[PDB]
Design an enzyme around this catalytic site. Structure first.
Site, short mmCIF file in Angstrom:
data_model
loop_
_atom_site.label_atom_id
_atom_site.label_comp_id
_atom_site.label_asym_id
_atom_site.label_seq_id
_atom_site.Cartn_x
_atom_site.Cartn_y
_atom_site.Cartn_z
N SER C 120 0.64 -1.24 0.04
CA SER C 120 -0.14 -0.15 0.21
C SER C 120 0.77 1.16 0.07
O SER C 120 0.71 2.03 -0.98
CB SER C 120 -0.96 0.03 1.34
OG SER C 120 -0.19 -0.05 2.49
N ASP C 184 -11.26 -1.41 -1.27
CA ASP C 184 -10.13 -1.26 -0.47
C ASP C 184 -10.03 0.20 -0.39
O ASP C 184 -10.19 1.11 -1.27
CB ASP C 184 -8.78 -1.52 -1.50
CG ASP C 184 -7.69 -1.64 -0.95
OD1 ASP C 184 -7.52 -1.59 0.15
OD2 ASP C 184 -6.59 -1.98 -1.85
N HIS C 306 -8.15 -5.34 2.06
CA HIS C 306 -7.03 -4.63 1.74
C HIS C 306 -5.82 -5.72 1.74
O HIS C 306 -4.71 -5.49 0.99
CB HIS C 306 -6.70 -3.69 2.74
CG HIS C 306 -5.32 -2.95 2.55
ND1 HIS C 306 -4.93 -2.65 1.28
CD2 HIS C 306 -4.54 -2.35 3.40
CE1 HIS C 306 -3.61 -2.05 1.65
NE2 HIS C 306 -3.35 -1.99 2.65
#
Ligand SMILES: Nc1ncnc2c1ncn2[C@@H]1O[C@H](COP(=O)(O)OP(=O)(O)OC[C@H]2O[C@@H](O[C@@H]3[C@H](O)[C@@H](COP(=O)(O)OP(=O)(O)OP(=O)(O)O)O[C@H]3n3cnc4c(N)ncnc43)[C@H](O)[C@@H]2O)[C@@H](O)[C@H]1O
Lengths: 473, 397, 569
Positions: C120, C184, C306
């Site tokens: 991320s 997400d 996620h």
């Protein structure tokens, strides 16, 4: 399209203006109501019909001064109101927009279903103007306005059972409000709650039928192509101006100016070329520049009514080069007082628009430059010269005059020659006025006999044959 | 030099070049005058004479300059201009100098203020004789009986000029040329003289101010073409063409022009004071061409254009004043070509969807406007041409 | 592997490296045969997303022009805007202490096809590292330096519209791939305001870190993204520009825009979109819940999906792959993802605007490919200039005197060229031309040949009618923007691996005391010497007897003329 209006409505309903506006208006509710509420983000005030506005003229002026002082800090101020409060706020902001500069923060008035009666004459001035951008009217779907002579102005946010859509066309707003006005007024709090629930919803239906969007869409392309077709016609207008420039250059070869040549061939048409200069290379330019001035005055091209410099820079030359040709036709009919009564509107508009930005420039002049091709900065110069002639002959034809009219005509001649020497000293006039067959030399010959014993430095400059050196290296 | 170059050319071309010397020296002439003179005198076709003009321009004998963007159409050669050099004109006039005045076919007569030439007293058998009058001329000349004259050219310079009397003696005159090259519109009178001549076919009038209805009072059948350039305003059975060009005081067209049935081409060019057209123009039977070029004050066209059955060619042009078209053009089946250059203020009516087989010649914006109805109309040959911004109009300054 | 260009082995190795790089908070280098992967380490803290020193409502900092030269608009001059914390981490890992530059050089020495992966917050740094590698080594030689790929999983937005435009102009958007799931929060967390989520950031960031407030956080994020999604399509369509200007200053929107190729994923399908604007509208509609039961478990599923990115690697081949922009029949593939009906027309309009842009580009190239257009330049460069050079003067002074008739032809076939060039400029300024059009070499050469032939005549027309007395000097104000645009484009094109106003200077130095214009005279004498050889100005016309420059050099004092380098006369 319809989805674009729906997206705009979703943006403005999730922005949170309508909820706070309705809450503050109802809290002020819980005649003329004035609010001094100040917020950290933006100032929001509620003003809650001609007699009511005229009664509070002093309070209106004080509030306008306060709003100008607040907008000087680059802070947006919004004025809202109730049913009658909406019309009161709309009148107030329409009166205040004239003093408010477009470069600063423009006041936005937000009204919730205010019925106002404004004739089409008032709507015509703000048909495509930015003033429609100031007023925002939000009305219910069932609620309508019964208006026969009144015309709706500004954007109209029409809410439905699911969502709200904005209409930026006056014809569509009139078609949607074709029904009679609804006496019952629903609570706008429930309408705002339903709009928020619809914005939270994933799907929203289109309430506007195809017949409503069709006319809007087809007017869009024409109102958007007028701009670009004027932009592209600017170029052949430049070619017409070049034609006129070459005509003037050829006329300079003969010992006579182009103004006097136009004046003498307007009465005795011949040679087949001045006819084309007058009817072909002149009407196109006049019509195009009139349309451009009207469109720029209606809706500005940029902030503070600033048209593109490419347009005004050429319009200045156009005016300074064409206005004498119109003065010739105006004075040949026998009319007088052109600079005050007979001057057109677009000429003055272009003059003001050039004078506004003519201060920020860093221009500087030197005397050594050749002024043969220089254009006269005062386009109304000839408009004065002819007038002086009307005085000169008036001194010779009429015998038996009262001496006081003789004195005031002598004062007129004195101030005219003073203005002539003033514009000659500053080198702001074209040297084509000293030609042999020019009108200025005729005026000088007619004035020399009347002057006689009285003398000035202009008379010495003319008699010493020093006008030939003027405007040359 | 000049004689070998003249002999090297074609015999008909050489004769035309020799006859072209009738005009005044160092003058600017339009090609229509010479074209009509060569058509009526020699009898050859107009296209081959235009080709002869182009050939003489290729040999640098005469200078041809166009003054209009329109191409060389059929019968329209008024925009073009033909000037001759002084040396070439003098060389052409020097030929046939040994021949007498009456023996030679082409003759030149120069008049004084009050005196007259010796040849004007005696009879001359010339077919071509031109008289040049100054401003001080009082139209006083000796009488001459010269019936062989077939072409007469007049160069006027007076404000008040009287037509000669011996015009009544002429028998087989075919064309009349009156060109006022002065400074003010010449005034003419005594028209009945031309009423006696029964063989006049084409009359031209330049810069002469006369009343309009005096022409129908002549009642001439042999007249076939009438032209009026820069003129400040059952009788006509065979008159076929009326050319009214560059008339500035033309507020309304007279009524006698509408009554004739034999007109086929009515050209109204550079008339910037005419904004209205009479309805009687629709009473015309066989109007093939109706030109309204450059008349930039013509507001809208009369309804009577619906009655025009054989209006084949409608030469509309840069008419800025045009803002409306008739409601029914589709009734004009024989219509073939329409030009809408620089005139877009008028909106295309619905009738354009009805008529088919049109060769439209317009500009970029007018072509794009007409392309909106392109799928509707059948095989509309929309052609977009180019504009050449020339500076040839500074000769007629 | 057609619309993206990546196989399954590279994705598997990149995911393994990114998972292994979760330790030591440092980049992990993994070499396998030819591929050298660098997996950046993620950072899960409140300071990792918003810089503490930055006081703006959104993390914003203008890229330094010295470091990133290609990330700018060559026409306007506005530099790109990126996040501050990601850039700080970038120069921190790029310092010689981390030895990342040495590893990158060692990988570029022998190995090829360098790919950058990350999680991320690791993908945000990987995108900037790929940009840095493209601007350092790839811009020197595209054939020598292999095309560097980049594969990120759930990385948030890092660049703005200027960043996407700069990536599209240089045709570098084909090297970035970002995998995003239907639910997400990280890819959509940067569009939210810092003050809106200032309290909720640390808790959810520690929860999302491997090894009641969530609902309000997701609601605030989606509400902040809805405004941007609406304003984007409102500005793209152009509806109510005045209303948009009135409502624009009232609230602050996040300028972050998606950049690079995005590959949406779900249980069964793998949709890939290559349109920069369509992804912004697609994210908001895909994050939406159809019924209230799915919206109840929306945050608990969004915070869980996620990390569920490993199933994408194993089930890549079994999933359906289809391209949205290229292939038609988008209804089924858009409905399968979860978008409603009203977003479908928004996406279709965002896709059709690009087709309209391509059609406008085709119209422009068809117009400029005609012979009528080139005929004017041919007559200018072959007829007017040589016949004016035949006389004892140049085409600059002959246009000023305006004695002959060819000057009218120059005026008309200069105004006709200026009109169409300003039309093309206005089309390219109002976001109606593709980003690659300005990068085309043909248009650059055409603009340069037009400038070098028309600008002298333009200066002659400006100074011959005394317009500078009313509109000030020509160089300061009164110069058309087309010449500046062409000059900047030509300079950026020649400097990626002016002399036209020369006369505009000669008119200013003429008629001035020599003691006052010492530096200007000598600087012009130093510059035109190279301006002659590089091709901006011509040697023949300026050195004629009838030229204005010769008279200006003669009227100069003999002391300066003796030591002047341009002693030719
Ligand atoms: N006194 C005269 N005496 C005799 N004849 C004259 C005279 N005057 C005119 N004629 C004749 O009129 C014809 C055309 O008229 P004419 O008056 O139209 O003359 P021309 O326009 O053909 O030539 C003028 C020259 O001035 C430059 O052009 C810039 C630029 O083009 C635009 C911004 O350019 P852009 O940047 O693209 O615009 P934007 O993008 O909108 O800027 P933004 O608002 O910030 O967004 O301003 C233009 N501009 C700058 N200064 C002036 C100025 N003083 N006057 C007019 N335009 C100006 C360029 O060097 C051109 O040679 C000429 O050919 C002449 O035959």
């Amino acid at each position: 399209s319809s989805l674009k209006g729906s997206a705009l409505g979703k943006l403005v309903v999730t922005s949170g203006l309508l909820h706070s506006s309705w809450s503050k208006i109802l809290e002020i509710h819980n005649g003329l109501e004035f609010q001094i509420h100040r917020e950290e983000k933006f100032t929001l005030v509620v003003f809650s019909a001609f007699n009511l506005f005229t009664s509070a003229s002093t309070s209106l002026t004080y509030l306008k001064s306060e709003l100008l002082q607040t907008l000087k800090s680059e802070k947006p101020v919004i004025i809202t109101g109730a049913a009658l409060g909406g019309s009161v706020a709309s009148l107030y902001t329409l009166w205040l927009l004239e003093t408010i500069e477009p470069t600063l923060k423009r006041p936005l008035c937000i009204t919730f279903g205010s019925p106002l009666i404004g004739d089409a004459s008032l709507q015509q001035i703000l048909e495509n103007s930015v003033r429609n951008s100031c007023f925002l009217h939000v009305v219910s779907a069932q609620t309508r306005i019964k208006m026969d002579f009144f015309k709706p102005f500004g954007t109209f946010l029409i809410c439905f059972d699911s969502g709200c859509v904005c209409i930026e066309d006056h014809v569509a707003v009139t078609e949607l409000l074709n029904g009679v006005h609804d006496s019952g007024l629903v609570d706008y709090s429930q309408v705002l709650n339903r709009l928020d629930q619809s914005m939270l919803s994933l799907a929203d239906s289109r309430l506007i039928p195809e017949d409503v969007i069709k006319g809007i869409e087809k007017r869009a392309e024409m109102k958007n192509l007028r701009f670009d077709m004027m932009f592209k016609k600017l170029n052949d207008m430049k070619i017409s101006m070049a034609y006129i420039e070459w005509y003037k250059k050829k006329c300079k070869e003969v010992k006579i100016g182009y103004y006097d040549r136009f004046k003498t061939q307007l009465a005795f048409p011949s040679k087949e070329f001045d006819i084309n200069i007058k009817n072909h290379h002149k009407s196109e330019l006049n019509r195009f520049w009139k349309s451009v001035v009207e469109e720029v005055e209606r809706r500005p091209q940029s902030d503070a009514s600033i048209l593109k410099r490419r347009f005004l820079f050429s319009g200045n030359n156009y005016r300074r080069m064409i206005e004498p040709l119109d003065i010739a036709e105006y004075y040949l009919e026998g009319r007088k007082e052109y600079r005050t009564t007979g001057r057109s509107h677009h000429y003055v508009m272009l003059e003001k628009w050039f004078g506004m930005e003519s201060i920020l420039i860093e221009k500087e002049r030197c005397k050594k430059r050749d002024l043969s091709d220089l254009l006269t900065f005062d386009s109304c110069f000839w408009a004065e010269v002819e007038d002086s002639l009307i005085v000169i002959n008036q001194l010779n034809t009429t015998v038996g005059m009262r001496d006081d009219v003789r004195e005031v005509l002598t004062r007129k001649l004195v101030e005219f020659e003073g203005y002539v020497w003033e514009i000659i000293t500053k080198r702001e006039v074209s040297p084509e006025i000293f030609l042999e067959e020019s009108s200025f030399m005729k005026w000088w010959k007619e004035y020399k006999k009347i002057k006689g014993f009285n003398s000035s430095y202009l008379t010495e400059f003319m008699n010493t044959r020093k006008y030939e050196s003027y405007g040359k290296s | 030099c000049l004689q070998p170059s003249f002999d090297a050319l074609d015999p008909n071309l050489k004769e035309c070049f020799l006859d072209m010397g009738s005009f005044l020296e160092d003058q600017k002439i339009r090609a229509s005058v010479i074209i009509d003179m060569w058509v009526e005198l020699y009898g050859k076709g107009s296209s081959i004479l235009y080709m002869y003009l182009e050939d003489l321009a290729s040999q640098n004998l005469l200078k041809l300059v166009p003054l209009g963007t329109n191409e060389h159409e059929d019968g329209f050669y008024n925009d073009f201009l033909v000037t001759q050099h002084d040396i070439l004109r003098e060389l052409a006039i020097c030929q046939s100098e040994f021949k007498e005045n009456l023996e030679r076919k082409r003759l030149n007569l120069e008049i004084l203020e009050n005196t007259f030439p010796d040849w004007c007293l005696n009879t001359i058998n010339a077919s071509l004789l031109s008289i040049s009058t100054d401003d001080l001329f009082s139209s006083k000349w000796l009488e001459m009986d010269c019936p062989n004259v077939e072409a007469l050219v007049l160069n006027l310079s007076s404000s008040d000029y009287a037509l000669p009397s011996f015009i009544s003696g002429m028998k087989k005159l075919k064309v009349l040329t009156i060109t006022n090259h002065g400074f003010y519109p010449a005034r003419l009178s005594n028209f009945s003289c031309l009423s006696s001549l029964p063989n006049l076919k084409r009359i031209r009038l330049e810069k002469v101010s006369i009343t309009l209805l005096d022409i129908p009072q002549l009642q001439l059948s042999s007249l076939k073409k009438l032209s009026l350039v820069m003129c400040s305003f059952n009788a006509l059975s065979k008159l076929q063409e009326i050319d009214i060009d560059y008339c500035y005081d033309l507020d309304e067209l007279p009524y006698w022009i509408s009554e004739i049935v034999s007109l086929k081409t009515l050209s109204i060019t550079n008339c910037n004071k005419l904004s209205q057209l009479p309805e009687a123009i629709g009473n015309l039977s066989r109007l093939e061409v109706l030109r309204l070029c450059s008349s930039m004050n013509l507001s809208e066209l009369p309804e009577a254009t619906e009655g025009l059955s054989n209006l084949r060619f409608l030469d509309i042009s840069h008419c800025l004043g045009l803002r409306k078209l008739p409601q029914e053009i589709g009734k004009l089946q024989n219509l073939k070509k329409i030009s809408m250059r620089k005139c877009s203020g008028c909106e295309l009516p619905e009738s354009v969807t009805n008529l088919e087989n049109l060769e439209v010649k317009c500009d970029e914006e007018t072509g794009l406007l007409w392309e909106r109805l392109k799928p509707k109309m059948r095989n509309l040959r929309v052609q977009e041409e180019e504009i050449e911004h020339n500076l040839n109009l500074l000769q007629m300054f | 592997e057609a619309l993206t260009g990546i196989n399954g082995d590279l994705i598997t190795r990149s995911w393994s490296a990114s998972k292994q790089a979760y330790l030591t908070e440092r980049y992990h280098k993994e070499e396998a045969g030819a591929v050298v992967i660098f997996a950046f380490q993620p950072s899960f803290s409140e300071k990792d997303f918003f810089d503490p020193d930055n006081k703006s409502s959104f993390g914003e900092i203008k890229l330094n022009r010295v470091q990133f030269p290609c990330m700018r608009k060559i026409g306007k001059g506005d530099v790109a805007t990126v996040n501050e914390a990601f850039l700080k981490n970038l120069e921190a890992i790029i310092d010689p202490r981390t030895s990342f530059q040495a590893s990158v050089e060692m990988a570029v020495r022998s190995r090829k096809q360098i790919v950058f992966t990350g999680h991320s917050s690791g993908g945000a740094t990987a995108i900037l590292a790929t940009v840095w590698y493209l601007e350092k080594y790839f811009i020197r030689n595209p054939n020598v330096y292999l095309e560097p790929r980049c594969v990120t999983f759930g990385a948030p937005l890092v660049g703005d519209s200027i960043f996407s435009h700069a990536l599209g102009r240089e045709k570098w958007s084909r090297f970035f791939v970002n995998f995003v799931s239907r639910f997400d929060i990280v890819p959509r967390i940067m569009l939210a305001r810092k003050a809106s989520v200032e309290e909720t950031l640390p808790h959810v960031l520690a929860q999302l870190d491997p090894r009641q407030r969530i609902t309000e956080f997701y609601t605030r994020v989606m509400r902040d993204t809805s405004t941007v999604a609406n304003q984007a399509v409102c500005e793209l369509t152009g509806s109510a520009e005045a209303f948009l200007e009135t409502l624009s200053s009232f609230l602050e929107l996040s300028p972050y825009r998606p950049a690079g190729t995005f590959v949406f994923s779900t249980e069964k399908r793998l949709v890939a979109v290559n349109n920069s604007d369509a992804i912004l509208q697609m994210l908001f509609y895909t994050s939406q819940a159809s019924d209230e039961q799915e919206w109840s478990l929306i945050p608990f599923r969004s915070i869980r999906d996620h990390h569920s990115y490993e199933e994408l690697v194993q089930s890549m081949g079994k999933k359906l792959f289809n391209h949205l922009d290229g292939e038609n029949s988008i209804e089924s593939t858009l409905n399968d993802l979860g978008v409603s009906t009203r977003g479908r027309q928004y996406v279709q309009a965002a896709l059709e605007e690009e087709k309209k842009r391509v059609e406008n580009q085709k119209k422009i190239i068809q117009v400029i490919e005609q012979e009528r257009f080139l005929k004017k330049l041919a007559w200018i460069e072959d007829e007017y200039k040589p016949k004016c050079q035949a006389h004892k003067n140049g085409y600059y002074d002959s246009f000023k005197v305006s004695n002959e008739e060819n000057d009218f032809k120059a005026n008309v076939k200069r105004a006709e060229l200026a009109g169409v060039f300003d039309e093309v400029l206005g089309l390219m300024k109002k976001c109606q031309l593709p980003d690659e059009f300005e990068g085309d070499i043909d248009w650059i050469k055409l603009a340069t040949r037009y400038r070098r032939l028309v600008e002298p005549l333009d200066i002659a027309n400006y100074h011959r009618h005394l317009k500078n007395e009313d509109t000030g000097p020509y160089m300061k104000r009164g110069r058309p923007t087309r010449y500046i645009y062409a000059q900047r484009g030509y300079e950026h094109y020649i400097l990626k691996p002016c002399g036209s106003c020369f006369w505009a200077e000669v008119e200013e130095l003429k008629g001035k005391p020599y003691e006052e214009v010492e530096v200007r005279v000598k600087t012009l004498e130093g510059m035109l010497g190279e301006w002659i050889t590089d091709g901006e100005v011509d040697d023949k016309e300026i050195f004629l007897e009838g030229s204005t420059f010769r008279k200006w050099w003669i009227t100069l004092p003999k002391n300066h003329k003796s030591h002047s380098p341009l002693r030719d006369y």
